[PDB]
Amino acid sequence: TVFRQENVDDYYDTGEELGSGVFAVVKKCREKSTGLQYAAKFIKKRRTKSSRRGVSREDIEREVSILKEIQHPNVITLHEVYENKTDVILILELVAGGELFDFLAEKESLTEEEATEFLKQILNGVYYLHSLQIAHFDLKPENIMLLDRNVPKPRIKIIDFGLAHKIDFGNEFKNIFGTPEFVAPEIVNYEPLGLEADMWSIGVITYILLSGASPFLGDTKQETLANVSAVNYEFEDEYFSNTSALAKDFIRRLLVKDPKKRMTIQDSLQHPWIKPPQFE
Ligand SMILES: Nc1ncnc2c1ncn2[C@@H]1O[C@H](COP(=O)(O)OP(=O)(O)NP(=O)(O)O)[C@@H](O)[C@H]1O
Numbered sequence: 001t002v003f004r005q006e007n008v009d010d011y012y013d014t015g016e017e018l019g020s021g022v023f024a025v026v027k028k029c030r031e032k033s034t035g036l037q038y039a040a041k042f043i044k045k046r047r048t049k050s051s052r053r054g055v056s057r058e059d060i061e062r063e064v065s066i067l068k069e070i071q072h073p074n075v076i077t078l079h080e081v082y083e084n085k086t087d088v089i090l091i092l093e094l095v096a097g098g099e100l101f102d103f104l105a106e107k108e109s110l111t112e113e114e115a116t117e118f119l120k121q122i123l124n125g126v127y128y129l130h131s132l133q134i135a136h137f138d139l140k141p142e143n144i145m146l147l148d149r150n151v152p153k154p155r156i157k158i159i160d161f162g163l164a165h166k167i168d169f170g171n172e173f174k175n176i177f178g179t180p181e182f183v184a185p186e187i188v189n190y191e192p193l194g195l196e197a198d199m200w201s202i203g204v205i206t207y208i209l210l211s212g213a214s215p216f217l218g219d220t221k222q223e224t225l226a227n228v229s230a231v232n233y234e235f236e237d238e239y240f241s242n243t244s245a246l247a248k249d250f251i252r253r254l255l256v257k258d259p260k261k262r263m264t265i266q267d268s269l270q271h272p273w274i275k276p277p278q279f280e
């Protein structure tokens, strides 16, 4: 699909850099006609067919397609898309309160309530996505943003649809591989992938939220991946001694090697605790 080829600078003014990735840079911007602010994600295009620099048009179009489908309080949303010879520029809903990653770094250790307040919103967003048969495939604290970091219980939006795929046959097979710390065993082992991989990532995020420690993280990427595939984690008493047994139960039912045996997003919302890049 073609996108708007007018100069985005004719319509927006850019400001502070919000973040970046390997082939993307995200800048705060303001739309001239409305004064409204957005996050403009500039994705570098591939210069040739065989090139390894840049993102393939197929991959850019998938992210755009998926983003166009979604409207939910806990997901990022797409306003407009522009392109030029070098970039596709997604004008995204601005999430101005920083990454959950940065909040967790700056904050003292979370209470179980603080953890479940973030987690319930993540679960609601993922419920929405999975209802649409969208697997996010890159859930992790840097891909969660807070609307406003200065309130007691910050509201969040899931961002970064760069690895997201529609799962219309129950599984996909094109290996998608995110960050070792957060990927499920089926990703590590290059097996067919579905919505279950997100549920594993939620288990890892939950472990981190409650403890400030990462369940599988080793000193090298290969060590982490080996730990993930073997389900080599435990609940360290030093971090978890005042954490409830129900919270541990929730995590234990997500960090399951067999994706068929792992809790689904619906299971996770009914669970008694809740119910009211890979290479060195
Ligand atoms: N809508 C948004 N509002 C505010 N900040 C954003 C938004 N989208 C992205 N960012 C920031 O920009 C960073 C990179 O954008 P992202 O969509 O994650 O592209 P990426 O390069 O595919 N992911 P990564 O490689 O993990 O950084 C994020 O980690 C955020 O810090």
Ligand SMILES: [Mg+2]
Pocket: 021, 142, 143, 160
């Ligand atoms: Mg990202």
